[PDB]
Every structure is written in structure tokens, then in C-alpha cells.
Design a protein around this motif. Structure first.
Motif, PDB file in Angstrom:
ATOM      1  N   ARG A 447      -3.500   8.172  15.037  1.00  0.00           N
ATOM      2  CA  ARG A 447      -2.356   7.553  15.713  1.00  0.00           C
ATOM      3  C   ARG A 447      -2.425   6.033  15.658  1.00  0.00           C
ATOM      4  N   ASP A 448      -3.637   5.462  15.731  1.00  0.00           N
ATOM      5  CA  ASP A 448      -3.791   4.014  15.580  1.00  0.00           C
ATOM      6  C   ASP A 448      -3.457   3.568  14.161  1.00  0.00           C
ATOM      7  N   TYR A 449      -3.838   4.380  13.176  1.00  0.00           N
ATOM      8  CA  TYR A 449      -3.578   4.079  11.778  1.00  0.00           C
ATOM      9  C   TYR A 449      -2.080   3.923  11.524  1.00  0.00           C
ATOM     10  N   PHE A 450      -1.269   4.903  11.924  1.00  0.00           N
ATOM     11  CA  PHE A 450       0.138   4.809  11.558  1.00  0.00           C
ATOM     12  C   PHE A 450       1.030   4.143  12.612  1.00  0.00           C
ATOM     13  N   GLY A 451       0.620   4.097  13.881  1.00  0.00           N
ATOM     14  CA  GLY A 451       1.469   3.546  14.923  1.00  0.00           C
ATOM     15  C   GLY A 451       0.924   2.322  15.640  1.00  0.00           C
ATOM     16  N   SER A 452      -0.347   1.989  15.407  1.00  0.00           N
ATOM     17  CA  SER A 452      -1.017   0.883  16.101  1.00  0.00           C
ATOM     18  C   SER A 452      -1.087   1.115  17.615  1.00  0.00           C
ATOM     19  N   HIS A 453      -1.250   2.378  18.037  1.00  0.00           N
ATOM     20  CA  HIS A 453      -1.268   2.767  19.442  1.00  0.00           C
ATOM     21  C   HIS A 453      -2.557   2.421  20.177  1.00  0.00           C
TER      22      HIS A 453
ATOM     23  N   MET B 125      20.145   8.569  16.411  1.00  0.00           N
ATOM     24  CA  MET B 125      19.396   8.686  15.168  1.00  0.00           C
ATOM     25  C   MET B 125      17.896   8.626  15.432  1.00  0.00           C
ATOM     26  N   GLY B 126      17.179   9.668  15.013  1.00  0.00           N
ATOM     27  CA  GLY B 126      15.726   9.646  15.029  1.00  0.00           C
ATOM     28  C   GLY B 126      15.222   9.010  13.742  1.00  0.00           C
ATOM     29  N   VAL B 127      14.123   8.257  13.853  1.00  0.00           N
ATOM     30  CA  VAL B 127      13.500   7.578  12.718  1.00  0.00           C
ATOM     31  C   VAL B 127      11.995   7.820  12.784  1.00  0.00           C
ATOM     32  N   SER B 128      11.386   8.142  11.645  1.00  0.00           N
ATOM     33  CA  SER B 128       9.949   8.353  11.612  1.00  0.00           C
ATOM     34  C   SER B 128       9.329   7.564  10.471  1.00  0.00           C
ATOM     35  N   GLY B 129       8.125   7.039  10.690  1.00  0.00           N
ATOM     36  CA  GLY B 129       7.499   6.320   9.603  1.00  0.00           C
ATOM     37  C   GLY B 129       6.484   5.259   9.964  1.00  0.00           C
ATOM     38  N   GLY B 130       6.208   5.115  11.258  1.00  0.00           N
ATOM     39  CA  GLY B 130       5.280   4.094  11.699  1.00  0.00           C
ATOM     40  C   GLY B 130       5.859   2.733  11.375  1.00  0.00           C
ATOM     41  N   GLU B 131       5.018   1.698  11.482  1.00  0.00           N
ATOM     42  CA  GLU B 131       5.517   0.375  11.116  1.00  0.00           C
ATOM     43  C   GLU B 131       5.548   0.183   9.601  1.00  0.00           C
TER      44      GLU B 131
END
Lengths: 468, 468
Positions: A447-453, B125-131
Motif C-alpha cells: 500500500r505504501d508502494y502504490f499509494g504512499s500511505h 467517476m471512480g479512478v484507480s492507479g495510485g499516484e
């Protein structure tokens, strides 16, 4: 001239009024359909009991001793709300309303507040026991106004199931807590029935027991530690023969049994509050999957479920008794979840639930009635701070001794393609709750990898973000 | 002077703004704390792109071409409704509002009609993909006004992730259907994370692999049928070394990761609607369990899981390749639950979801992206009315060939006390859904015994009550 009133006369309402009249109380009775009021008055006569039947609600109100006490047994819906508004037009200060339907606890709180606007005390009370318990003695779980509890205290003690010389009734706590406990009762009930039904399939398809042997084995378990109301009726049910065929009647019943009412609510509440209840997932999965029978029969057509060929030298000499221990072991695991849910919520609601007393009143009257609940009650008598039930010293040793039996049951059902979700969930639950370190360290990293959580560390304080 | 506006400039909103201008659009931008708005302009300048930043909401609305288009990316809560009430003060008929946040669909449904009262067209609208997906290309799931979809269509096609040359965006359907599919996306995402994490513990505790071998296995799985974003990054994660210790970084992350937000929602909705998602229980139970670290640590002290000593009588020569087949098999089962929930809700809501198109747009951009999703798209192209996913011809053979690997992984984890709830639930789900007759006939009989709830028969019409 009446001690208590009762609204709603299904066979459950009829039985309970005869139960209250049976213990020497002047009972008033109402039903919107008048024919049911008369049918109650007929059987009262034939049991040499007196029940006064009235034709409108307000005609009943006028014949109770002050402070007035009315039990409601209306099917939940807008109808329970109309009746309460109608009851409120004629009550005044000190009068008491007792709702006995299976209600979502939020609705009762909302009414408990509306009734204190009129200085009427409300008592939302769960009742379990079927029609038989309604007539001869059931488990009452009243919650709300302590004042209201004391005025009905006498009546509920004598009509409740009697275990020893303690009645199956206690003051649960304030607000709508009693509705909530009855909900969790139905949650545990759903788990027990699923664990039992998985024992039915295991012995039927692994040991190849016929229905006569299956009923004999369940009676034998009911003499031992698995002594319970549901284990007893499964022995009766699997022995009952059909009148319209040569088959066993249970083999002619259709397997569509959806999750109705109070079952979903405990799972919804476990999901929302983050308190895991895997055994009730499996029970609800099993019920919800059964509704899609048309899709199930076309599914099995594509994946042939052939007869199970047991390996000739596979050790099944002790298997029946391992299944007996596995089932007992899952009941400890399953109740551990239920009582954990009740403890967490009791703290969030300032309810001060006495789980020793909750276990005690469930020893008789209710559907999950069993000697096993008397053992839970002693665990709480022994330590009231107990947080997980299998952390009690005697349940601890039970687990250590019987867990290999559970591992053997899951190993064999997995080997031979027998679906046992409740056994699997309970074993998986136990392994996870007893794991100091779980692989959620990888979940936090992903989760930290893709979202920086951010994540936290084992060695130091604070939030940390890593550039991966 | 602006093609579109954007509200909310966290790193994700900043990245999406840079994405929209890098594709040749003029984008205006606002954030409550103005300091983040200015950093967005500085990144735009250092990356030679132009982003117009506004100190005020009002100046951003006054520089949008007609019809005006604004995207909202605010943390869900009362702030979302504040802007919408504020935005609706200055919008006119034909202007468009696009909520891009992860919203509970019911909230969006109320906002759509509250907007149509002022003739403003709404698009949830839902969006997925991290930063990373926000800057270079993500998965867009717009639902609501089909008119609104067509006005923003160009921007979403150019800013979505590109697979082949087809963009990861589709018109999902009316109302808040887009919020719902983003919800199920996160529901499926949770399961994948749980299944990967169970593959981690099995290989770490049965095969005794170190983090270097673990990283190596995941990468070579990534070269094959398990090719996915989530398999790729856990391989990267397991190789990363800590800067503050001589350990691997993943071994220093603390394992408390509770379920928060859109995770519980998918389970709340499956429970309420009676659609079983057992693999999503296991994912949510594991996360909910991890919060109670103090209790898990007290629990393991009593039930020491001391020795994990593999008996050298065990055939592990093919075990790693069995686990790959086990993990792939659960993905089909897990997605089968997820897509079944989507199909049923689409029928209850008259959404007419195109599950082939949902799968197509999930092949890139989103977190669950995988080659595996390209098969799901073709499975539905080949069969539009396909009701369970693994009933497609080539997934069916996939199950039949790989399920024996699935049974062995459950078998070996049961023997060695390895908790794998998602693997167990997935197998029990499959064996139940593919069974024409399940033991709920016994459940119906018990319910009739104590409650008189009546039952239906194998052979004939109607309702039946029995005296047992």
C-alpha cells in the motif's frame, strides 16, 4: 384488573399468554384479527386457565393495574410503530412498553427516546425458544429502563426456562442492548447449525453412514460434551421417516434456505466495526449460496462430482471421535468470536454487559441451549476480565488437546472435496488470532508502494514513507 | 480560458493535473490550502507544462469554457457537499460536475438528483492507479449522465492508461454505477493482496525461502500467467534492503493494517444483498485481526507455535509449481465472486453493466491490472450472458487442471498450522457453488422443528409443516 397485557397472537403469542396465565397472572390479550383472540380463549379454557380477550387496543389498556405493562409481539415493520403511537395516546408517566420482536437495535433506541418524550418507559426485550419455549419456558433478554425491568421482573422469572433454581432472565443493560444480544444469539445459532450440517456431510460421504447410523451417532454425542438442543433434534430429524414416500423426510426437503433477518445483522455489524467473525461468514455463505439452486445444478453439470473413493489404507479407525472433538473445538472457536463482538460493542455503547449473566440465561430456553454454555458461564465467573474465551485455562487445555482432531477433519475433507467452510474458517481463525506476526507487513508495504500511505516500524516510532 | 477544472491537489490531484495538460489541454486548478496549489505550478514549470492555479474557487469557475467541467478530488466527508453546494451557486444548465473520489454510491445518488434540480449534469467517476497512474495513465470508471460522459470523453481517453491503443475508460452506466465498480475493484484488490500474502508465508515457512529467493520466485511468476502489477511490486518489495538496519525492509514494517473505507463497503453490500464473497471475508478478517496486536501476542504466548519442522517424508519436489497453480486458481474463483456481485447488482439497479468492458479497462492503469484480466474480457466477448466466470470454456479447463494443486496447498498448510483463510475460503466456495445438493435441507428441517418456518420439497408443490 389485569397484571399484564399482550399484543399479537401468533402461536408464539398464544403460547406465551397461556404461560403467563399458567403462573397465576391476570393476562389481557389483543389481536387485530379477532378470530385469533378467540382461539387463544378456547385453549385457555381447555387448559383451565383464564385469559381475557379484548377487541380493540384501547379496550385492553383499561383493565391492567397501574403502572401499565404491555408486551408487543408484532412482526417488525411499520406496524410495530403504529401500535406504539397508538399505545402512547393512553399511557402516562410510569407506564411500561415491552417490545418482544426481533428488532434492529437502532430502531429500538429511536423508540426508547420517543417514549421518554411522553414519560413512558420502554423495554426492548429479545426472546428465544420457539413455540415450545414460549409455552413452557424460554430465555428472556430484556434491556432498557431499569425501572421497567423491576415491575416486570416477577413475571419474566417464572415464565422463563428454569435451570436449577435460577431463571433464564437477567437485566441486560440500558438502551437497546437486549435486541443486540438476541441478534448475536441468532448469529451463534447460525454457526452451530452450519457446523452441525458439515458434520452431517462428513459422516455421510467419508464414513458412508446411512441415516439410521447418523441419528444414532448424534444421540450419542448429545449424551457427551456436545449435549445441546440442536444436536438432539438433528438426531430426531435424521431418524424421521416420510409418510408420503419410503425415503427419509430430511432427504426430501429442498435445500434453499436464505439468510433471513437477524442473521445478516450480526455480520453487517461485525463488518462495520472491524470485529472478525469468520464462522458466521461461512454460515451465511452457505445459506446465501443455496438460493441460487438453478445455477448450482448447471455448475455441477460442468464439474462432475463423482462418488468418493476412500483410500483402502487410510486411518479412519478413530475418525468419528476426531470429528466429535473437531466439532467441539469449532464451537469454542465460534463462541469466542461471538462473545468478543459482544464485549467490544458493550464498551463502545457504555452498556456494561455481564457476559457471565448472558451465558447463564442461555443455558435453557433458547435455541443454542446446551451444557456447553454452562461451561462458558463458569469461565466468566472465574475471571470476569477474560477477553478471549479460549484463553480460559480449561478451554485452553481443551483446544490444545482437540486441535489435532480439527486438523485431521479439515485434512480429510480437503482431500475428498467435501465443502466445510465453517470448519475451515474456525481453524484458520484460530491460527491467525494466535499469530504474533501476520503477513500484513507485506500488505502495508504494497500500500505504501502504490499509494504512499506510510507504514510504521517494529524498532522505532512514527510514520515512514519509502521510495521503492 | 480553461478546458476543465480540478479541485483537490494532493499528490494524486497534482499528478492528474500534469497528465491532463501534458495531453494538450488547458486545465485550471484549485486547492483549499493554497500552498499546495503553488507547488503544482512549480512542478508544471520544471516539467515545461502549463497549469493555471487559482487562489479561490470562484476565479477557477469564471475561467472555464462552456459547458464548464470541474473534477473534485476531496477526501470523502462533509467537504464534498460543501464544494458542490458552493459550485452549484455559480454553475448554469449544461455545466458538468465530476466527482472523482472514492464515494459510497448512495451518497452519489442523492447528489445526482440534487444537481439535476438546477439542471447540472453529474458524473460520479471512480479512478484507480495510485499516484504513478495519476500522472502517466489510470483506469477511469465514469457513470452518470451519458451527456456528461460525451463532453469529457476526449480528456479521459487521452489521460487513461493505454493498452494496445484502447483507452482504459468506458461509459459504465447511469447514476452512481461508477462508484460501485470502483468499490468492487477495491474489493477484488483486497483479495489479491491477501492471496499473495498467503503465498508468501507458505513459501517462507514450508519451503524456508529467504527474501532473495522469494523475490526471485515472484518475478518469474510475473513472466508467466500471473503477470500483474501486484505480483511485480511484491517481488520488488521483498528484495528491498533497509537503510537503518542490516535487515530486509519488509521485515521491519509493523503488521497492523486495519480495514478502512471502501474495503468494508464491498462486504457490507454483499452481506445485505445475499451474494456470497467468502474470499473477501478472509481478506477483511485478516486485516481486522491485525489491529489486535497486543491480544495476538498474548494469545501466542499461551498457544506456542514453536516448531515448524517439515517431515522429510513429504513430496515437495513440485510444491512451488503447485502453489503457482493454486494462486492462479484462486484468482479465477475470487474474480468469479467479484463479477457475480457486479452482475447481480446491475440487474437490481437496471444498470446494464458491460462486464467485458469493465474487464477491458482494468487491464491497465488500475491496481489489479494483470494479463489475467484480458482473458476475462474475451470470456465475456465470447459469451455475453456468462453467469459465473469459471463456467467459460477455457477457465473451466483451467480449474479442472489446477484445482488438484489448490487442494495440496490447503493440505500442506493445514498440516503445518499455516493460516491461509483466502485459500481455504476460495476452495470451499468453489466446492459449494458447484454442488447441486447442499446440506441446507438439514438446516431447513431444524428451522421447521423449532420455529415452524415450513419447508419445500424435492417432489411437490407448496409449503409443508411437520410434527417431529
Amino acid at each position: 384488573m389485569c397484571d399484564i397485557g399482550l399484543i399479537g397472537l401468533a402461536v408464539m403469542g398464544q403460547n406465551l399468554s397461556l404461560n403467563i396465565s399458567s403462573k397465576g397472572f391476570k393476562i389481557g390479550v389483543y389481536n387485530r384479527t379477532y378470530e385469533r383472540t378467540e382461539e387463544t380463549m378456547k385453549r385457555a379454557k381447555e387448559e383451565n386457565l383464564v385469559v381475557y380477550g379484548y377487541k380493540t387496543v384501547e379496550e385492553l389498556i383499561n383493565n391492567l393495574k397501574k403502572p401499565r405493562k404491555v408486551i408487543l409481539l408484532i412482526k417488525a415493520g411499520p406496524a410495530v410503530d403504529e401500535n406504539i403511537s397508538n399505545i402512547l395516546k393512553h399511557f402516562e408517566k410510569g407506564d411500561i412498553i415491552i417490545d418482544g420482536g426481533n428488532e434492529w437495535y437502532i430502531n429500538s433506541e429511536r423508540r426508547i427516546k420517543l417514549c421518554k418524550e411522553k414519560d413512558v418507559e420502554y423495554l426492548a426485550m429479545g426472546v428465544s425458544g420457539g413455540e415450545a419455549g414460549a409455552r413452557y419456558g424460554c430465555s428472556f433478554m430484556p434491556g432498557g429502563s431499569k425501572y421497567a425491568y423491576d415491575c416486570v421482573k416477577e413475571i419474566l422469572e417464572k415464565c422463563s426456562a428454569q435451570v436449577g433454581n435460577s431463571p433464564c432472565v437477567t437485566y441486560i443493560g440500558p438502551g437497546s442492548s437486549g435486541n443486540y444480544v438476541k441478534m448475536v444469539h441468532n448469529g451463534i445459532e447460525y454457526g452451530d447449525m452450519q457446523l452441525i450440517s458439515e458434520s452431517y456431510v462428513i459422516m455421510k460421504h467419508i464414513l458412508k453412514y446411512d441415516n439410521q447410523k447418523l441419528s444414532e451417532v448424534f444421540n450419542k454425542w448429545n449424551e457427551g460434551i456436545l449435549n445441546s438442543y440442536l444436536i438432539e433434534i438433528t438426531a430426531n430429524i435424521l431418524a424421521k421417516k416420510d409418510d408420503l414416500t419410503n425415503n427419509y423426510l430430511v432427504d426430501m426437503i429442498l435445500d434453499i434456505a436464505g439468510a433471513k433477518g437477524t442473521g445478516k445483522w450480526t455480520m453487517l455489524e461485525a463488518t462495520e466495526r472491524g470485529i472478525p467473525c469468520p464462522t458466521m461468514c461461512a454460515a451465511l455463505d452457505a445459506r446465501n449460496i443455496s438460493v441460487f439452486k438453478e445455477l448450482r445444478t448447471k455448475a455441477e453439470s460442468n464439474f462432475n462430482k463423482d462418488n468418493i473413493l476412500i483410500d483402502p489404507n487410510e486411518d479412519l479407525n478413530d475418525f468419528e471421535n476426531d470429528l466429535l472433538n473437531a466439532l467441539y473445538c469449532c464451537k469454542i472457536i465460534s463462541y469466542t468470536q461471538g462473545l468478543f463482538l459482544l464485549k467490544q460493542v458493550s464498551e463502545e455503547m457504555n452498556w456494561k454487559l455481564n457476559l457471565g449473566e448472558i451465558a447463564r440465561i442461555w443455558r435453557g430456553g433458547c435455541i443454542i441451549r446446551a451444557v456447553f454454555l454452562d461451561r462458558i458461564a463458569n469461565a466468566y465467573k472465574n475471571n470476569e476480565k477474560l477477553e478471549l474465551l479460549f484463553l480460559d485455562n480449561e478451554f485452553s487445555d481443551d483446544i490444545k488437546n482437540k486441535l489435532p482432531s480439527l486438523r485431521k477433519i479439515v485434512l480429510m475433507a480437503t482431500k475428498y472435496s467435501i465443502p466445510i467452510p465453517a470448519f475451515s474458517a474456525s481453524l484458520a481463525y484460530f491460527q491467525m488470532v494466535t499469530s504474533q506476526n501476520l503477513p500484513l507487513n507485506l500488505v502495508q508495504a504494497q500500500r505504501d508502494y502504490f499509494g504512499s500511505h506510510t507504514y510504521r516500524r517494529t524498532d522505532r516510532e512514527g510514520n515512514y514513507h519509502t521510495l521503492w
